[PDB]
Amino acid sequence: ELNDQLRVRREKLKKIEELGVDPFGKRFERTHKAEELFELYGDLSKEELEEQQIEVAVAGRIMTKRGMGKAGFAHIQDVTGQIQIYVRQDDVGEQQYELFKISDLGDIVGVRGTMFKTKVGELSIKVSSYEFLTKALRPLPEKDIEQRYRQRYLDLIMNPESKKTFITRSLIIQSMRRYLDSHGYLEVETPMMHAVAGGAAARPFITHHNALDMTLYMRIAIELHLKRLIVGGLEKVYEIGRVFRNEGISTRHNPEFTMLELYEAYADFRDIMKLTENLIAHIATEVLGTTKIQYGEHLVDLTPEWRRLHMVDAIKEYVGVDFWRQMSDEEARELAKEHGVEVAPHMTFGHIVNEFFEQKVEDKLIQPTFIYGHPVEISPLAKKNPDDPRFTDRFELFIVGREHANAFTELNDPIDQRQRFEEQLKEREQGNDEAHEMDEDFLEALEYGMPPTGGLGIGVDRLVMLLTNSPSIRDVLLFPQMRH
Amino acid sequence: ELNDQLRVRREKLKKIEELGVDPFGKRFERTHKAEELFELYGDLSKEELEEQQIEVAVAGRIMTKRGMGKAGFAHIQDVTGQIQIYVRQDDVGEQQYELFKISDLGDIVGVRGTMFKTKVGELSIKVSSYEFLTKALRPLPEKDIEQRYRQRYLDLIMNPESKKTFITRSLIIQSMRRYLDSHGYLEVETPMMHAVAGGAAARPFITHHNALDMTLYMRIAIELHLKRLIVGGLEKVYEIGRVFRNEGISTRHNPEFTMLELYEAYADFRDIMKLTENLIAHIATEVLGTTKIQYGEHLVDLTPEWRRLHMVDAIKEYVGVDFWRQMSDEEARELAKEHGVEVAPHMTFGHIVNEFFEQKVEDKLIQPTFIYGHPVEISPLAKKNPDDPRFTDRFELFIVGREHANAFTELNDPIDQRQRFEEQLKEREQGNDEAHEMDEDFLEALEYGMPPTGGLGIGVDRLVMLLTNSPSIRDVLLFPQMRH
Ligand SMILES: NCCCC[C@H](N)C(=O)NOP(=O)(O)OC[C@H]1O[C@@H](n2cnc3c(N)ncnc32)[C@H](O)[C@@H]1O
Ligand SMILES: NCCCC[C@H](N)C(=O)NOP(=O)(O)OC[C@H]1O[C@@H](n2cnc3c(N)ncnc32)[C@H](O)[C@@H]1O
Ligand SMILES: [Mg+2]
Ligand SMILES: [Mg+2]
């Protein structure tokens, strides 16, 4: 249907060339961007602009073009929006007017001219110089949820709002580092290719190094090397880097995502809760100018202090079941069968409690909530709670029914840590193939002495979704993993 | 080595618990860093301190200890330095003093006490409260790049100069993003898992996605996806991220390294030259306080503007062979034989010229130098020079004999880009297993139109090696890839 349409364009290219101009342009000096023009000359009168001859120079893509004859208009779009340009043969000459006439929607051009207003009052640029910058061999679509991610470049051109989202994303990450850097946290870079994939319960992407003939695993967490830094005496460190998990895609999951991992010597999980809430309220204030944001049909208030609720209590409140009493694994399995909570063959009281939470409770936590007291069985890298060792001084931040962060009072006792790992291995022989793996090197590190520490993990992408009211993670990732 | 010392520390742990103490501590609130205490109170005499009775709280690892019966001293080290603590049973009580007595070198403790100077004059802290915070089961290093790289934590604790290097690295990167952002370049995040390993000439790490059953390649460059963003109308983008290349290690290369990639629509490689020198000059100025630096035996002057030299003129200056001469591939092969320049079967004029440069010229370029005009055969993503099509508008930045950047006037003409890819595939046929691979998606992207663009790539690790006078990249990477 539109196969020679591409040939129509492939022809104007030949014509443009033989017309003596580089169809793919040279450098172009600009003076402003569309948005600056309106903010600087949007309120000036038509005749005072005509008098002032304010010369500008801009560049962009042709989104709309109209008017035949010896004069025409077109809307040029740059990163900040669109601005109308007006080209008259009796102004730019014949060669340039010809360049304007052959120009296609989608083609990129640069112009020099003066500000002025049409009778209808639109602010525009009276072109006195029309430069051809780039020929588009394929036309613009016209003005598909999944076709937007498959060709993000087309999306960014056609939907202004998407652009805003990604800009907002850059501001969020930038705001995060300014806060952390100013509070003494050292931004560092640790390995992404590991001998042993530790720091979480997750399946890894496996690769191989040819020269060193080594099997390397892409990191499923940043935790283990950062901890080595704490043993290293660095005290405060953070890292915002990519993490990789051989998992299937979700509305809130992507194989490679961005996580913030930070550790603070001499702090515990309650300290981290405060850090977490201040950090996020800060970012919201700095970037959006407020702590009250919309997400779905919810108005989420990020103003500290946020609710602290123990996982076991959350379960009593939303389910009506108690896990505070001493309980046998058998009794936990009964309560599970009764409430329709699924359990794995390797699960025990601890795992079951968490299943009760994740399956019957979490989705209902809308306002920022610090869920704490995660059972020790599912927290192999966290310190046991003193008063009741069945649970740990760990917490997960929940907002709009999903986890935005994971943190704990770190386990620096190396003997206990080794014991957690063996238990993890036992769980594996029992069906759990996400059980953590023994890392002697890491354990060796703890053996030189890691001070008491508080660690924090934050899903940056998810935070971005929250602050941009994005229903899917693929709306906040420039090139989400495609099924292909 | 410490067969029993281990038994002794191990058994010591048990004794701390009997004292009723958590051998791995709780959180501890500090008031200052050791260094701040010297900067604030070092000038005050012994009695001035006695009058002002300055209460403080510090924490650190025990570096030295002296036990004089019922009172002793110890030097504890925090991230900023050491401070001496004076612990007398008369003040802290018998219980706490037994904790002090049993404390081993390497153990971490925190104290609260007042500032004061001993008869000798060393600023100290007369402790009123001694808190055991962590037991080191192994004794710190007794003293080879081995443990420094394999056990970086020990290095960071025992060698302050290594610690500063990593602190300076955080500053260099922080400084870089400062310039870029304030100059309008948008920081973004693009995929590290690619369907096609393109954007560079390198052998990648291959991996597999289970759920989607798909072969993925770890990025060998960030280029392609960033250019899709320029097509997207983002105009000015940058990404400081990890890049992976399945190549052997050396003092100049690590399999996973940090590269800065940035693109600017409407600019060309000359514009990029100016940016590169301003950026680097900015970082050095802001971090070292000067652009005049020392690297090894060299006194390198980073003050712009830097020397501009065409690769061909460089070969003429440093070797004597003039490649401006139109010659056949065979004559170039003959010239290669006569000057001891090794070539490969797939090579023609263009490749040979570059080998003359890398083999015979590179190492002689000490002062910052912009080498430009790379032959087209090795520049598949760079636009060809208008005057002499054998070369492209591209440059590499050489300093102290090594490459620190690669950049060019981007090839935005899709017909020509396709042609280059075909040439590369052809080379791979002839044995060049580092030839760029085809990426239809990228070609489709350029087909929608990409403005003339200026692209740049800087090896961040190498820039930091330069600014910290680190002879090896393994000195600016917290945990470098080690040999099996
Ligand atoms: N030492 C304290 C804990 C630090 C973090 C820990 N090392 C870790 O690996 N945690 O993993 P998670 O708790 O599963 O991840 C933390 C956050 O990252 C986000 N996240 C996790 N997995 C994905 C994913 N696959 N895709 C996108 N986002 C993800 C989410 O917000 C989650 O709460
Ligand atoms: N579009 C303009 C060019 C952008 C960069 C281009 N896409 C690219 O891939 N370049 O690759 P190189 O030029 O080989 O690398 C750029 C810089 O990275 C550094 N580098 C390259 N490989 C390693 C390495 N293996 N280890 C440490 N640093 C490295 C070095 O400074 C080098 O000059
Ligand atoms: Mg979580
Ligand atoms: Mg290079």
UniProtKB/Swiss-Prot annotation, chains A, B:
Co-factor note (free text): Binds 3 Mg(2+) ions per subunit.
InterPro entries (alphabetical): Aa-tRNA-synt_II, aa-tRNA-synth_II, aa-tRNA-synth_II/BPL/LPL, Lys-tRNA-ligase_II, Lys-tRNA-ligase_II_bac/euk, Lys-tRNA-ligase_II_N, Lys-tRNA-synth_II_C, NA-bd_OB-fold
Catalysed reactions listed for this entry: tRNA(Lys) + L-lysine + ATP = L-lysyl-tRNA(Lys) + AMP + diphosphate
One Gene Ontology molecular-function label: ATP binding
PROSITE patterns in the record: AA_TRNA_LIGASE_II
A GO BP entry: lysyl-tRNA aminoacylation
Pfam family, any one: tRNA_anti-codon
Cofactor: Mg(2+)
Top-rank EC class of the record's enzyme: ligase
Enzyme Commission number, as recorded: 6.1.1.6
Record-listed Mg(2+) 1 binding positions: 396, 403
Subcellular localization, as worded in the UniProt entry: Cytoplasm
Entry keyword Ligase: yes
Disulfide linkage: none
Record-listed Mg(2+) 2 binding positions: 403
GO cellular component: cytosol
SUPFAM superfamilies cross-referenced by the UniProt entry: Class II aaRS and biotin synthetases, Nucleic acid-binding proteins
Primary localisation category: cytoplasm
UniProt keyword annotations, A-Z: Aminoacyl-tRNA synthetase, ATP-binding, Cytoplasm, Ligase, Magnesium, Metal-binding, Nucleotide-binding, Protein biosynthesis
Record has Ligase as a keyword: yes
Ranges that cross the membrane: none
Subunit field text: Homodimer.
Similarity comment: family membership: Belongs to the class-II aminoacyl-tRNA synthetase family.
Protein name (record): Lysine--tRNA ligase
